[PDB]
Design a protein around this nucleic acid. Structure first.
Lengths: 60, 129, 148, 50, 167, 210, 44, 323
RNA sequence: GGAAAACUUAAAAGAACUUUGGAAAAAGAGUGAAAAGAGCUUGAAAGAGUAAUAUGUGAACGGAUAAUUUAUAAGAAAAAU
RNA sequence: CGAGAAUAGAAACUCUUGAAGAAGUAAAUUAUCUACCCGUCUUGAAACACGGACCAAGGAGUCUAACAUGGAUGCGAAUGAGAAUAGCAGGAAAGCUAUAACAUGAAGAGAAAACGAAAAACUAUGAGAGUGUAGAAAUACAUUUAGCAAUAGUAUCUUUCAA
RNA sequence: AUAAACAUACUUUGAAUCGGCCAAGUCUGGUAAGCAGGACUGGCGAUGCGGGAUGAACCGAACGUCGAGAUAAAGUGCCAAA
RNA sequence: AAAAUGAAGACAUUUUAACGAGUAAGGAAACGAAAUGGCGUAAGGACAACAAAAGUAGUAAAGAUUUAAAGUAAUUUAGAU
């Protein structure tokens, strides 16, 4: 009892019903696996600005 | 004043194959068969109930006399349509005796309310009277 | 309510809501958790990826009563006595009476350090303490006792 | 006064409720069916509008 | 016929107070009339939130009201949900309008010097919304949200419904 | 309401005991009421019927008076010599009458009716003294709290309270909002019906005054 | 969730119903009451 | 919270007592129909008795199917010969004298469970519903002639009631006999198969006499009056306050029961003493009315003017309709 | 191994005498509120019989539209000046 | 000649049929047009594919137990305690009351020993509220304030060889 | 440039289904097949209506109940409207 | 779908506009502008002449056979026997 093996018929029609879900903007802004020194520079500055901002909030 | 009551189909929607078989009654049933002649709307047999056959909302459930129907079981039931004698009509229930029917009929004339069973369950005043 | 099921809204439909090609047969792939590694493997892989195997040492007769140690954080300490008692002794210091929040009476053994404490002295009586819990209690001007 | 929907009718000594007016204070009325007025009559020389 | 993208189905927005609560149906009628006539976004916002389901009306504790109105002293927090009491932190003086106050929450607000208004009181005092701060609770703190998805996923796994021999 | 646990309120069980009752308990069920003349002399309300007793039929087509000729405890009926029907060919047959549709006019008292009637006479007396003792005790308690009033006020006409003090409750405004749709369209209909009834009555009085 | 139901054995003969629970309260109470009547500190 | 005064009348003399009683805060509880329907739907099933069919019914045969090749169906068939039963259908539910569909088992779920605080929420919403004459009358109660809708009688008059003639006399003085006679005049027989099981008479509902701890001796007098059901203030439940899931039973309070209502339920500011952990809740709105806010915005000139939809013009043909 | 089968009436008052017939029965007559007449409360469908009406060349039946026949079924007020 | 505009201009009718049955509706027949056997598996059955002679009655997603989502409900860092069980009136398989063990949860990670959470947070966009001008009926333009939910990324902290 | 606010972005729960068949200004095996198997699309399956006499796929065109009008494919000696 | 009105009218409100084929399958109850609308069978708890005799019934119940009416339909209603 042989059967039909495979067909792409009605597969592009099925894919375009609920069409190609584009990735959100949050997907392009990830920073995993970036440069180690570049990551160190960003963390060093973000800790410097955060401490200065939190100190001013503490004074008042 | 009375509007034109228009019905879009005055016939009856009979069950399919009810004419050929007696076990199949005439009460309508939508055919769910995968090869049914009627449900595929073949020419000649494509008569099924649809919401489009519905009658006008203004003139729906209205008797030919121009009024609606309001069943009554006693004289006090008539007091609920005395303000609307031009819109409703009394219809004595099928179980109300002949003695109680006269009291309802007499009061309905007093209250100017029409009765659709005005000649119902009457005595033998047709022969020898 | 049998009148509210789908059986009463599928009276007249031949297949009773189960399909004509694929009938409602007895089994749909076995009885129970059958085929955990053969034909329902993709189910176990997708939804229970650590169902099969072994992990950790066996404890032949586990004593779960020896692992019963209810814990309360520092921020929830003063709720054990009440808010009115908290304001009553809100202006105490060393030398005068300070309420003792014994946690064993309330069914708490270990005191953990999370959140913040009101700026009042307090005496916390508990069986076990955390390293960061004791710091917060002492930084506010209090004491940490021990029991049993 | 009587309600607009209430048109009292005589009772042939049949049972009536306590709130229904008795026969001695009921005067019957003739059923009216003619509402539209007839055509006006004008002179013998002016042509009709129709 | 006509070639359309889709056929008209019912819009998935609630426009009435769900259930048979005779008082919630009155608030919807009160604010449906206010939003229609005054045409203020505040009354429209309150009307929209009054028709959300219970799971979409999360609670706000007195701790969150205290922090949100720290720089808003002469204000009136408006939250269309139950307001619970945080027993770990003090309750300052503040006027809060809410659907329901927990017994311990109402006592804490009253004793601190605040006022616990319902929603028919706020519509009488600030119908268009003049000294109000709109507040809604967190929606993602539900335990059900942990198990949504496939736990085998490499990025954001689910939380593995417990059952037979769950290690 | 019944409070004894040893008896049943089941019609099926009650009927079965009525058909399987032996001849001992069938006689007590087969009782008739004494007439006015015999009731005053004997102070006895009802006694089981006996042969040769004279009864008068009070319910049925023929209210004749005759003598009891047969007391059929199996059929739960009796026979009266006057009440007979001819059996088509000429012979006559008795007609069964239920014992509860007759009243005894003349007693058949050989020696045991004296024992029974006397025993049923003191029994009536002993209960009256028991009821009398209880009835006066209730009077003693009532007058001890209401000395001015008398026990006879309960057997006379009652005058209701005409005052109609209303109470302000902040829920009468929502009364129509707590009503379901079926029971609100019926409450509002009764309001409209009553107003129309009252409008005609007011109009009728104006004409009557005129 | 992986189901763990021990219904493969004959549970229908393992079912115990508590229909006698309301009548157990009356039975026990009528024993305590009738124990003190024998000698009151018997149920002390 | 003014909680207006409630007058107490005397059953015998018909004279109102000198000192009124403040209205208990239970009558101010929110009147929630949905919550009552939840509780009544559950507790109405708690009186049910276990039932079931014989476990061996229908399956008391030794039948096996005849198979195929015999021009008969494959349903199991009775074995043997000599009777008409042999060769006939067997256990199957479509046959005759077989078992039915899944047979009823006596270990079903007859009685239901409801949270206690939800049970008290419904009762507080059912006592509060008996003080509204619109709902009490809508339920089918004749309360036109009663002096006050929270009918409270003197505890001195109740204490002298020892016979049904006196209890009837009291009901006539407070004009409560209009509802008692309605049940008497309209008592009929049941319709259907229910009369075979003993349920023949089907009466209506009348006044509910709620008494207290000190009115125990007067219960026996009220119990034989048709369509009059008595209850105690502590034992109140939706099965009495809202019979048939319709709220607003005509409740006749005694003096002791009325004065105990504040102790049992408490207020909206005090927790109940007779119900540990229960406090009367506040409605979703303070004043359940809408006109007080309508006139506030009108006074403040915050609303717009009412709009009548403009009559849209029917489409015309400018190329032919010169107008 | 293993069935099927409940019901006259309130009361048998369970027709009772004549004619035809070998007899069973039938026709009268009578009982009963009513034959409900014992194959007995009501009495459906399948299948027949009688009466009324209608139709017809290798199926029958149904639907839309009209014609014929039959049936149903709308009224007692009243003009201008 | 004459658009706008200002002043004066005007429509209330006939005939026929019907309680001797009008308009409509139903049944039967006739005539034109129209009409393949239902249910089913199947790519495809009116099928030379199967079941079906006819009628009546019975006849098939139910119950128990565990979990989850979701709509209405009560309470809320608690919820339940109709866990057993003990009392109350009333006589009650119903109703009411029980400072109560425990179940879920408030704290999480590790196989386990052993532990056990703040820089009283930061950034971005975002819900709402005013003021003025203008179109001008509706409403739009400019400015001041606000930071909720949500998403994402950040510093900090608990446990782990590893977050 | 054009279109799009009952737009857009979704979240959760879940049913049925994975025997397919047909056409072609297409292809591979085969002498060929109403044969076997594929790329793109449109259909039948799940679909009636008007036309091709009759036809699952062809042509026109997709259906709430109707009245009137122009039309589509295609037809205008009779069956059969022209 | 959007505007208007909204304690009770009523026909599940008023107006405007677009839309309406369909196998397997889905659309549990409740939700005043209602998150599909309803018919039918049996049983349980209430309601059913509001002036103190309160749904129908020997002046004829249920059932059965038919004649008509209402509803798109499921079905309901009434007349006669």
């Amino acid at each position: 009892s042989k059967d039909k093996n495979r067909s792409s018929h009605n597969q592009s029609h099925k894919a375009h019903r609920n069409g190609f879900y584009k990735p959100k903007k949050s997907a392009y802004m990830s920073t995993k696996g970036m440069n180690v020194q570049v990551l160190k520079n960003t963390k060093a500055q973000r800790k410097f600005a955060l401490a200065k901002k939190l100190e001013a909030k503490k004074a008042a | 004043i009375k509007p034109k009551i228009v019905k879009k189909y005055t016939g009856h929607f009979k069950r399919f194959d009810s004419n050929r078989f007696l076990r199949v009654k005439a009460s309508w049933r939508v055919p769910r068969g995968i090869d049914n002649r009627l449900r595929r709307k073949f020419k000649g047999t494509n008569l099924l109930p649809k919401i489009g056959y519905g009658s006008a909302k203004a003139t729906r459930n209205m008797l030919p006399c121009g009024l609606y129907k309001f069943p009554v079981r006693n004289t006090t039931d008539l007091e609920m349509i005395m303000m609307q004698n031009r819109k409703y009509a009394a219809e004595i229930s099928h179980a109300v005796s002949a003695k109680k029917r006269q009291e309802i009929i007499q009061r309905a004339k007093i209250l100017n309310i029409r009765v659709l069973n005005a000649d119902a369950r009457i005595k033998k005043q047709e022969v020898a009277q | 309510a049998t009148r509210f099921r789908q059986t009463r809204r599928r009276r007249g439909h031949v297949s009773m809501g189960y399909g004509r090609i694929g009938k409602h047969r007895k089994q749909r792939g076995g009885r129970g958790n059958a085929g955990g590694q053969h034909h329902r493997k993709t189910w176990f892989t997708t939804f229970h990826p650590d169902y099969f195997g072994k992990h950790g040492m066996r404890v032949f007769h586990l004593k779960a009563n020896k692992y019963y140690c209810p814990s309360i954080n520092v921020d929830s300490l003063w709720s054990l006595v009440g808010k009115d008692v908290q304001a009553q002794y809100k202006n105490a210091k060393v030398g005068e009476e300070v309420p003792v929040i014994d946690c064993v009476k309330h069914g708490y053994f270990k005191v953990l350090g999370k959140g913040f404490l009101p700026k009042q002295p307090v005496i916390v009586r508990a069986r076990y303490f955390s390293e960061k819990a004791q710091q917060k209690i002492k930084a506010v001007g209090g004491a940490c006792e021990l029991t049993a | 006064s009587a309600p607009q929907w209430f048109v009292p009718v005589k009772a042939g000594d049949a049972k009536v409720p306590a709130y229904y007016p008795t026969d001695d204070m009921i005067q019957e009325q003739k059923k009216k069916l003619r509402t539209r007025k007839g055509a006006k009559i004008t002179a013998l020389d002016k042509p009709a509008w129709n | 016929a006509i070639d359309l993208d889709r056929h008209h189905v019912r819009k998935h927005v609630s426009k009435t107070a769900r259930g048979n609560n005779a008082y919630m149906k009155l608030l919807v009628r009160l604010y449906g009339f206010l939003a229609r006539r005054t045409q203020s976004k505040f009354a429209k916002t309150i009307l929209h939130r009054l028709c959300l389901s219970r799971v979409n009306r999360p609670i706000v504790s007195t701790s969150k009201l205290a922090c949100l109105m720290k720089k808003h002293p002469e204000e009136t927090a408006v939250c269309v949900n139950t307001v619970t009491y945080d027993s770990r932190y003090p309750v300052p003086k503040m006027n809060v309008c809410a659907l329901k106050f927990t017994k311990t929450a109402e006592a804490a607000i009253t004793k601190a010097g605040g006022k616990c208004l319902r929603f028919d009181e706020l519509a009488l005092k600030a119908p268009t919304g003049r000294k109000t701060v709109l507040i809604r609770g967190k929606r993602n703190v539900r335990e059900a949200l942990k198990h949504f998805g496939k736990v085998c996923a490499k990025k954001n796994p689910a939380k593995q419904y417990k059952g037979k021999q769950t290690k | 309401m019944k409070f004894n646990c040893k008896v049943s309120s089941n019609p099926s069980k009650a009927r079965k005991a009525l058909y399987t009752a032996n001849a001992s308990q069938r006689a007590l069920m087969m009782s008739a009421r004494l007439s006015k003349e015999l009731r005053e002399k004997y102070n006895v309300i009802a006694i089981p019927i006996h042969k040769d007793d004279e009864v008068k039929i009070i319910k049925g087509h023929q209210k004749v008076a005759g003598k009891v000729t047969a007391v059929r405890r199996s059929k739960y009926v009796i026979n009266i010599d006057k009440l007979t029907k001819t059996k088509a060919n000429g012979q006559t047959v008795p007609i069964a009458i239920r014992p509860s549709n007759v009243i005894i006019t003349k007693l058949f008292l050989n020696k045991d009716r004296e024992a029974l009637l006397a025993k049923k006479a003191e029994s009536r007396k002993s209960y009256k003294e028991l009821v009398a003792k209880r009835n006066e005790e209730v009077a003693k308690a009532f007058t001890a709290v209401y000395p001015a009033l008398n026990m006879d006020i309960f057997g006379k006409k009652v005058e209701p309270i005409t005052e109609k003090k209303p109470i302000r409750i902040p829920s009468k405004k929502m009364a129509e909002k707590l009503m379901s749709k079926p029971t609100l369209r019926a409450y509002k209909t009764g309001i409209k019906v009553h107003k129309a009834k009252n409008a005609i009555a007011a109009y009728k009085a104006a004409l009557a005054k005129k | 969730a992986v189901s763990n139901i021990h219904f493969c054995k004959d549970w229908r003969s393992k079912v115990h119903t508590w229909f006698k629970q309301p009548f157990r309260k009356i039975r026990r109470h009528q024993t305590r009451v009738e124990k003190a009547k024998a000698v009151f500190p018997a149920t002390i | 919270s003014l909680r207006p005064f409630v007058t107490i009348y005397d059953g015998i003399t018909g004279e109102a007592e000198k000192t009124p009683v403040r209205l208990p805060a239970v009558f101010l509880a929110p009147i929630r129909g949905d919550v009552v329907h939840f509780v009544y739907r559950n507790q109405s099933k708690n009186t049910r008795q276990p039932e079931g069919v014989s476990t061996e019914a229908g399956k008391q045969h030794s039948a096996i199917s005849w198979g195929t090749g015999r021009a008969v169906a494959r349903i199991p068939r009775i074995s043997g010969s000599g009777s008409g039963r042999n060769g006939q259908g067997a256990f199957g539910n479509m046959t005759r004298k077989g078992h039915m569909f899944s047979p009823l088992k006596n270990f079903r779920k007859w009685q239901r469970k409801t949270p206690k605080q939800m049970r008290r929420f419904a009762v507080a919403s059912c006592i509060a519903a008996s003080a509204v004459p619109a709902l009490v009358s809508a339920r089918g109660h004749h309360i036109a002639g009663v002096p006050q809708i929270p009918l409270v009688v003197n505890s001195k008059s109740i204490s002298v009631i020892k016979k049904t003639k006196q209890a009837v006399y009291l009901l006539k003085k407070i004009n409560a006999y209009s509802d008692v006679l309605k049940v008497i005049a309209s008592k009929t027989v049941r319709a259907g198969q229910g009369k075979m099981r003993g349920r023949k008479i089907k009466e209506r509902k009348g006044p509910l006499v709620v008494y207290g701890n000190d009115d125990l001796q007067a219960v026996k007098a009220f119990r034989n009056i048709p369509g009059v059901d008595t209850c105690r203030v502590e034992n109140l439940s939706v099965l009495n306050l809202a019979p048939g899931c319709h709220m607003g039973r005509f409740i006749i309070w005694t003096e002791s029961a009325f004065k105990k209502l504040n102790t049992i339920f408490g207020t909206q500011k005090k927790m109940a003493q007779g119900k540990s952990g229960f406090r009367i809740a506040h409605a979703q709105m303070a004043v359940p009315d809408m006109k007080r806010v309508v006139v506030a915005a009108e006074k403040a000139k915050l609303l717009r003017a009412k709009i009548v939809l403009p009559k849209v013009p029917k489409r015309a043909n400018p190329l032919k309709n010169w107008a």
